[model samples]
Target: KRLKDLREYLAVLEAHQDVREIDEPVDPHLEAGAAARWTYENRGPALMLNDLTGTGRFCRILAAPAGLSTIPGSPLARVALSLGLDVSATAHEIVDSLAAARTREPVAPVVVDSAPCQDNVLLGDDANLDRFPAPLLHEGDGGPYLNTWGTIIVSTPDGSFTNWAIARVMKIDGKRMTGTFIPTQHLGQIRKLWDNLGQPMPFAIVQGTEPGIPFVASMPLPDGIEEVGFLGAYFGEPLELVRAKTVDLLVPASAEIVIEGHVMPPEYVVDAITYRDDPIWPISVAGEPVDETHTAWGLVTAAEALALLRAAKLPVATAWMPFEAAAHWLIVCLTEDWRERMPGLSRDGICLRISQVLAATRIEAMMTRVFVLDDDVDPSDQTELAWAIATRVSPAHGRLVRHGMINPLAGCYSAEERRLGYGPKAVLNGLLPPMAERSRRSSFRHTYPEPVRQRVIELLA
Candidate 1:
């Protein structure tokens, strides 16, 4: 079943031994971020810091909520369990199941008179940013950031569409935060619409919303499509929402913290050592994958890719983004039954179809490499993917697309390509040739008869 909210998801993690609560005081300046980074590196459990140094506020922080898990038989269990999938579900199963749900009706959220998010409201001077522990996630970070994993809600001036997305927001003062206003993002477009009318856009940042909320926010859903509606469809039920106290928008009824404010259309300096004006939100200091940003973003990237291929009626069995790749590559595994349907399908044709669809979607911005593998190879396994690339892929025969949207953060392009905001992307064909000669393996797992294999296992046991 879908988790009702973040609170419920935390409880589930606790029960599964995937979460740990720490009462010891941790510094929000650097210690807290260091702890979370250590957890990610060691494949540790999620952390709930009940106490932060120098603040009497009970403003808690749940770090690494979507980090990799070390539990046997369930490494990505946190993501699967949060999305209402079985703990042992494979990455392909989790993403493919979500892709299949794209056709379902989106359930609209219901508005209520009151909500838990409003339990303790702060207005005017009482709304101090220092009341909470906004961690400076890395050394040399510009300042304390409040919305790393949080959802920022914005909408058009006419109230025709609303957007929910996760963007890094840095605290400018007690009452001000400067965020990245990327015009290509949905939030950026909506903010531009409001800016055209010479008005500051009303906005709200929601921290610790439903587990699935972050997942949806991380995806590149079609432009003009509201995430709230998709949440209804994804959860298989109508979401509960409540009107915000300050903004003319609705937020998840169960969100832990809500910061209501307005965003202005202002030019600012970002990623520079020093700035003359306002410094834009620094997502990461070292440009490394340190938190939920990489994990959640990569997973949803795969989910969206899978949905796109399915919509195009391709023979895709599954798709995945190796989290460690930091949103640079996508692996599309072809269905085993595809050969049975199109016995003599041309490899070039197959590659072109898949590449065209990828280039047409918003995902192309973040993806530079797309690997099309046979169903027998597990895209989730790095070892298997490496093996397939070494033996099956022929780089000389691969297709290269020369122009499309490019992710500035990808850092794979030269200065000229960076200036153009476009670059070349490759589609590597890793599937076995239809008429290629092959040899049978001598390994027991593949060569032994079923009865003999069972007897060996029985004897070992």
Candidate 2:
């Protein structure tokens, strides 16, 4: 609803000073990633790397594509911009928006005859993947990953349920690439249909697509909800679908590029070889290193999908888009009344329930600490949060809740390690209190007040 297509979205980002074209050559190797690795404050404009100094042709790259904005109307809100939702939609509103859209008017995509994605097609011998520019994102990475943004296309034999999800794939040759298919996710579930019949799963890795496409892939929707249908809901109209030349999968007609390919036998095969970019561990989950393939793609897609779920009009009215790379543990930072209810429960009981939910949902990887906050406090902003924790939180009085904080996906708590899939977790409650109507209790004092704040503002102005 915000923009008709990807091009239109790009233009909006450009106009809002959110995107810019960089003529200077940047390598998709560590160089491009370094340039693109920016603070949330500096985010918005999708950087267009015009000259990649690698063995690749003209290929586009996006960074921190969408998340929280640096200032107000963060990335969480910006996602709604395309959905015709208010830009001020809070985290709660975002989750609600996506849930609402799921039921109200499932808009199917329109199929058209001609599309730019069909500009080039290769089949059999001509379909050499080396011809197109792919990227080696990190140093320790296995190979030129064509599938970092690769959208895996899978469908039922009846073709009634088509699932499009982004799964990371590394290049093996022109005809084949290795990608991970998580058994728990929908993509894997769909592949089982083809595999049960001893058939290779039909899939197409659509490249050069938009944020919306990848976002649709991360959602844990019901079994029959077609990925494209969810996508259509976001666009307020069906996405244009085009038939692939080789595979049976249908790709987005507006997709910038599509790689027609199929999943190899055994589901996943290991091909050990030399890789390019340095494998610097920027993020860790549950005390384990996560590749760029997992964290960025995983979290961004999940957040976007969750945003849409919130809009779909479901009982799942409010939800949290906590990054799994952060161990998938999001402190629900409840309203004031909720905080009071939380303290009444045993610190141990709270921790157990939290851990159990995360482990059951496959969302928790490793959780370090959980801080319960009031509605006035923003959970997403680490800076403000740390400030509150530092001054207001009493370390001695804090509760080390462990029961509900553990999950198996956490490297530290893997079945082999913990055996029972349990690990460490904690909670810190820093809410202000009445202090028995004026006893000798310590309090946090503001350094500056109204007149001082005004004069500081006046001086700067």
Candidate 3:
């Protein structure tokens, strides 16, 4: 069954005591953006904007409203619950759910002839991008980006498949949104197909559907995977979709809003007359910071891909910290059991799977710092992981894997010996301590004695 809309999801958060509303008046420009970053850094509450000055007319803004720390459990934890898993589920458990669901069910979505998303549709010269209170998230942001958090719906011209991925949208001119696509991914591939035919690709920047949609959209699923069907599996019922009024694609029937548009050849690239972005955020990868590495639109890109991947039945053991500082290095901490089990497993086998899967998926990173911890180590516990890295890792003995690209933001990307393009990945197998005695450190988890912890909780309650 169709689960809930954005508003309803907000209600769920509130009821669970995971979210709180703010009544203060705030500006929609850089100030709000800064406040959001500060709150995220402090692990504060989700901000609810009831009155955003000037941009109130734009779809009201919510900054990192569903951020990981603010949400109970974690961001991915909330996502797991949205997908019908237990609320306490961890990232590893969430991936297991995806893999398990992939085996038990084959989803077939139900298409509704008419739906609520059609409540408002503006097209051509009639469409006005300014109507939505799209916030200029940061001072250095290029424009009032329309897609920090939304789904872009596209399909094959032959109508064989429809792909819903998150791609950033920059308002180039009245009625036209620019899709910053790198041809390696699905959106880029689809754009290439349309450009090859010398035609415009019909698309929509869909917003306000299930919150899980944005999370799943940021993932990269294998081709031929059915995102809609996987969503149905997540909700445990057929997801209802509706056909677009101006195009052949289908969107979530219950989406709060949808921005209908098209991606065409370079001529279709409407000349952008606006140049008001401030560009203050420093972009850094590895250890060095660069100006071009940061973007207000970057988060939504990862979000859209993850949204699609969640729809499929794939084991999704992953980690995504707010790469707000630098988008280059990603800390991937897998359970020790999975890593130890990798040596005997083939490349196709999921054992020792992080490098292969990520390289094959083609996400650019100067380094993917991998730490295979015993199931006792929580990847989200960066403090603990950092301590482990300090005690266990030796630079000379660390492992490295080569790939097609390395993020320019990482200082390593500009190393004297570094190639301008993709480089070998530096995979740090930081698990055991250097000394055998130190490596035998006990798990901090209460697994030391569950009954004592449970009894203590019972007494406290």
Candidate 4:
């Protein structure tokens, strides 16, 4: 089955009892924001703020659309649904699917004659950004961020690069908008490219499309690669696109609203905004554990790393950045034969080699603590991880505190390291030491003989 747009994806989630529709009127201010925030702290389901107060024309907010689940059996259910997979799909399955899809030839998006996004347009003085209420996500937020969860599409003067990314954008009255125009990100870099040519960069901010489009837009794809075209790979079919009304860009045909305009060059100055009629835009309440930020980006990093490791012939069985840990830790499970394959290198050597392959990488940015555990433990299971860390790791020999640029915001850095912008990043070796070689380990599943285990399973059944 295929999910064509956000509504259909929500239907899938609803059928599974993973989402709730709040009929009571919710304010766009701190009230709606707090509800979304509480859902994360409680590890609750996604909430659809259907009855917004005075947010004209019924434009609703879908809070934490890809947030973690409270249900014990399927924690990654929402993420799986977003990617068009069954709710039962685990972190590894989701990661593996993404890696596999990346190798497939990008099924280029098909341009369509007319799109729903153009069903009703507001041009010149008629276009008023004040028509819809932009939700103030947090009390301390500088301003109401209108484009935090939407894709910002921008192209260079020569059309050499068209980057699609999700960047923080603030609303300044009805027409003007402000954002971070940094060089590191794909969009910011191209925005500068247009500036170099002395021209305003054409841009289109798209919100709400097929379930897969949002993730593809915000994912940390390599530079020079466009995001819209890759949407087809995830869908396993060509995506539909429509040329923008104002900008010279192709936006997702399934998009709810396309805010088309140009970000003035040499933004010694800044911007303009536009939108569609009777539109329902989605907003992800940005914050702590298991939000879209963790599941969406964190999962991508793990899968891509595993793919990279496998390409380099490193025996990485599975990779997971636990959302429960808020993605501060990265766990890579080595195959059962990892030691045999890496005969020349000791545990530390193998760890060093994996780090080498992932140098200045996605995992490196967020993961200050890395655990290279053997296959007996599941990287995605926090209980197993907790046990391994406590029992298997020897404080003296099992932990490697590398001196390097860890996350600047990470609390693990010492006073001096924090000031210097470098700190201790741990490579905690969770694989049991020489003790395992001398005497066999004990896991109920592994400890007993197969015949006895089989008998026990039959008796339980």
Show where candidate 1 strays beyond 4 Å. 267-291, 340-344, 435-438, 441-444
Which candidate, 1 or 3, would have the higher lDDT against the true structure?
1
Order the numbered candidates by TM-score, best leading. Answer: 1, 4, 3, 2
lDDT of 1 by residue, 341-444 (tens): 55566767788778888878888877788888888778788787888887788857775565776888786788988888878778888777653455554577
- Candidate 4 — which residues are off by over 4 angstroms? 70-72, 265-278, 360-363, 414-420, 433-443, 448-461
217-243 per-residue lDDT for model 3 (tens digits): 665555676667666665677778777
Model 1: lDDT of residue 257? 73
TM-score between model 3 and native:
0.75
lDDT of 3: 0.53
- Measured on C-alpha atoms, candidate 1 has an lDDT of 0.75
lDDT score, candidate 3, position 179: 54
Candidate 3 contains a number of clashing pairs equal to: 31
How does candidate 4 fare on TM-score?
Answer: 0.91
RMSD of 4: 2.8
What are the models' TM-scores? 0.92, 0.72, 0.75, 0.91
Superposition error at 82 for model 2 (Å) = 6.2
